[PDB]
Ligand binder design. Structure first.
Ligand SMILES: C[C@]12O[C@H]1[C@H](O)c1c(cc(O)c3c1C(=O)c1cccc(O)c1-3)C2=O
Ligand SMILES: C[C@]12O[C@H]1[C@H](O)c1c(cc(O)c3c1C(=O)c1cccc(O)c1-3)C2=O
Ligand code: NA
Lengths: 293, 293
């Protein structure tokens, strides 16, 4: 393989993490687990893998039994034809942790994984001790207000939200070329490019480089219309909620969570644009430790 | 594989066309000309070349001296570092036809080329006998209202408007793979895919497949902020204006032309989505012949 296997990556971490799989509802999920204490489910997003949490997993494992998953369609997990709505991907994770003998878990999610974390809390409150959303709120009607063009100096264009709606073309252009996508994303977020090194970037590129892998990634985005419909039906979250927001999304995240939950806490990742677990790991680990207790 | 040279393509058409070049302001432009009568400048768009007008050029040449150009950055023309705002590209064409000894010309443009035709009329009214805009209005403030997401019911994702704003990534993803881009575009427009054959698609792909060619194409889109600023300064067009609009863009084109011009005629290409010269050549040729007279 071009990059180290997940088994090797897992072993390279302090804290005795191990790479595993579990089959839930016919979908085989890959995850890495380790540490001792109450269960903590960590959910990554696009275009990343469980490896995105590499910087905070050892600190977290000191207090929690960490379970860092690859979503349906992601990394070492199966890439089925459908079920890429966040409600369904949340049910995967619910089945996973219940299968591992946990009645309720702490949950933290980032990017697409944050949407799943929120859907997890909304659909399975009894299995949700507390939930943390990193940067990304669940889709709602505001998604329909995203603009194609920004006036100069007024923000970053969310081009991938449009491009990933497409059939066929995304896998045709991006297969074998995902390192370029990853580099663009990081060029437009990281304050210092060395925050994510060459090999880690290639670990992600390897995960997404097959046509099937690119395609599965796009399904997360194409499911937005369904996600928005589902969001309208959700009741208010009553368990403790944490929002950690970067400089660009903090206010929006605060507004949406406060309207969607009764018990909200906010932490500002003041030096981050989007990739919180990689941009400010100590702030993220500390916030999660403080919040989950 | 390789495609015919522009000279072979030009000679392949009925009506005695010849492939030529002219250098204006240090920029060498490629164009194909033929026919007899008052001059008619034909301007294509993205990701196409002068060859987009092949279906209408013989008919038009029976009445006009046709001049079908490759824009700055397009096909056989030079690809300089800058000058891809529509005002500058129109000045290129103005210099071209003046250099060829024409005081005034008929002008028709499609897609990006329609923007250029409009700018030609706005900046060089004395050199503009009449102007025809095919499908695409000049950028204005409404460009900033384009939405990334459409509800599952309506139209096509305007993904290319967002994607082509990017630095580096477009040439990185699209080099050598433009045939897939072209196939996607046609899959989402032509009523019958045979309207644009394999060889024609490959002629376009050949023009755009190198990184520098992809890059030049994106410059037309990146210049949008400048184009919008320029549009704000334009007075109303007073020479005769024709808008030919595809079935779904007709109302928007009519509304915009009517607000920006005093003497507007409209023709509907009721069976077309966007590529008017290829989808409904008889409508396009007939409309231009009637209008230019
Ligand atoms: C669900 C997701 O659309 C995915 C994407 O991963 C995403 C999201 C938000 C961003 O603000 C954002 C990105 C993203 O790739 C990115 C790169 C650089 C700057 C920046 O601001 C971003 C998201 O929530
Ligand atoms: C300036 C330009 O943005 C360029 C693009 O070439 C463009 C434009 C309009 C379309 O409606 C349109 C396209 C385009 O590629 C396309 C493909 C399939 C359907 C469809 O409708 C379109 C434009 O005017
Ligand atoms: Na695809």
């Amino acid at each position: 393989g071009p990059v180290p296997s997940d088994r090797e990556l897992a072993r390279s971490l302090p804290g005795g993490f191990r790479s595993r799989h579990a089959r839930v509802g016919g979908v085989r999920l890959h995850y890495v687990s380790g540490g001792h204490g109450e269960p903590l489910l960590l959910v990554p997003g696009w275009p990343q893998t469980w490896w995105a949490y590499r910087k905070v997993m050892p600190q977290l494992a000191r207090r929690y039994h960490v379970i860092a998953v690859d979503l349906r369609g992601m990394g070492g997990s199966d890439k089925p034809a459908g079920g890429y709505d966040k409600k369904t991907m949340a049910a995967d994770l619910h089945a996973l942790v219940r299968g591992l003998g946990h009645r309720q878990v702490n949950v933290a999610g980032h990017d697409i994984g944050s949407m799943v974390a929120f859907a997890f809390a909304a659909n399975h409150p009894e299995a949700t001790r507390k939930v943390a959303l990193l940067d990304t709120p669940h889709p709602d009607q505001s998604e329909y207000e995203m603009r194609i063009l920004c006036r100069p100096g007024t923000g970053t264009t969310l081009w991938w939200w449009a491009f990933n709606q497409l059939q066929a073309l995304p896998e045709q252009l991006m297969h074998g070329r995902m390192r370029h996508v990853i580099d663009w994303l990081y060029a437009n977020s990281l304050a210092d490019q060395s925050l994510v090194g060459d090999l880690d970037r290639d670990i992600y590129a390897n995960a997404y480089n097959s046509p099937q892998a690119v395609r599965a990634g796009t399904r997360w985005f194409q499911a937005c219309h369904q996600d928005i419909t589902d969001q309208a039906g959700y009741g208010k979250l009553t368990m403790p909620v944490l929002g950690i927001g970067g400089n660009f999304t903090f206010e929006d995240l605060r507004n949406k969570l406060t309207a969607q939950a009764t018990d909200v806490h906010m932490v500002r990742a003041s030096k981050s644009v989007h990739y919180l677990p990689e941009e400010e790991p100590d702030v993220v680990a500390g916030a999660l430790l403080d919040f989950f207790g």
